[PDB]
Amino acid sequence: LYFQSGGEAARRAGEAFGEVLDAGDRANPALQPIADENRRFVRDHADLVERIYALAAEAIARLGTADPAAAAAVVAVMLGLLNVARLAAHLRDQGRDAEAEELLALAEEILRAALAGTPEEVTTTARAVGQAAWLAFVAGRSVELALENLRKVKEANLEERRAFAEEGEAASVRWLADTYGAEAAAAHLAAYAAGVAAAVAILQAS
Ligand code: NA
Ligand code: NA
Ligand code: NA
Ligand code: NA
Ligand code: NA
């Protein structure tokens, strides 16, 4: 990672995201279990965290951090691969290491290919990759569904990728409200947006 210029800046940005989301979730008894699980993930899967920062460093190298759209795209890449990594971590914790790699490799292929375009295109693809994994995680942690979803993103044009990201994001809001209640869900989503903004600003200053 150290010969991947940008890895330390990506880490600072991701840690800023994590700190802000942690504080938002930790402030509310309904959301604290999320903050605790997120700390456990980072503690237990340092190798996946570093792999996320490595892909972010590739995004920094290609897009720069000289403007808000590029910075947002790098953050979106990290958050999209993080969603993939949560399912990969489940697979690894359960001894299904090869399937975890297949999942990570396909997500990384799609994200890397998007880096040839504009930041706004990268952000759309990254959001779609994130939902491809998240939707499969909630539906029984199915690597088969995740791979199918990722292949559908791969074969989708930009508008179709955006539409899929929007459907998944809407389903995600619904899941948060169903699980934590609408009131706590709104607080969580606001903290998430603040964490994105924190990470964007760290990248811009890097
Ligand atoms: Na790099
Ligand atoms: Na505690
Ligand atoms: Na964990
Ligand atoms: Na996300
Ligand atoms: Na994303």
User: Is 192 part of any domain?
Assistant: yes
At which residue do the structure tokens 């693809």 appear? 125
Q: Are 116 and 100 in contact (CB under 8 A)?
A: no
At which residue do the structure tokens 């792999």 appear? 51
State the Cα–Cα distance between residues 134 and 88, nearest whole angstrom. 11
State the Cα–Cα distance between residues 10 and 70, nearest whole angstrom. 13
Considering its fold, how many domains does the chain have in total? 1
At which residue do the structure tokens 């909630």 appear? 138
User: Is 150 part of any domain?
Assistant: yes
In terms of residues, how long is the chain? Answer: 206
Within a 13 Å sphere around the CA of 130, how many CA atoms are in the beta-carbon half?
25
User: CA quadruple 48, 51, 56, 59: dihedral positive or negative?
Assistant: negative
Residues near 15 by beta carbon (within 8 Å), at least 6 away in sequence:
none
What residue numbers bound the domain in which 60 lies?
7-205
Q: Which stretches of 125-189 are assigned E, i.e. beta strand?
A: none
Residues near 173 by beta carbon (within 8 Å), at least 6 away in sequence:
185, 189
User: Is 1 part of any domain?
Assistant: no
User: Is 56 part of any domain?
Assistant: yes
CA angle, 158 then 164 then 169, to 5°: 125
d(CA 20, ligand 1 centre) in Å: 26
Report residue 195 as tokens: 């964490």
User: Is 2 part of any domain?
Assistant: no
At which residue do the structure tokens 């930041």 appear? 119
Q: Are 131 and 165 in contact (CB under 8 A)?
A: yes
Q: What is the CA radius of gyration of the chain?
A: 16
d(CA 165, ligand 5 centre) in Å: 9
User: Is 71 part of any domain?
Assistant: yes
The resolution of the experimental structure, rounded to one decimal in Å, is 1.2
Q: Residues with Cβ within 5 Å of ion ligand 3?
A: 40-41, 44
User: Is 33 part of any domain?
Assistant: yes
User: Is 29 part of any domain?
Assistant: yes
Give the technique used to solve this structure.
X-ray
Ligand index nearest the alpha carbon of residue 39? 3
d(CA 25, ligand 2 centre) in Å: 11
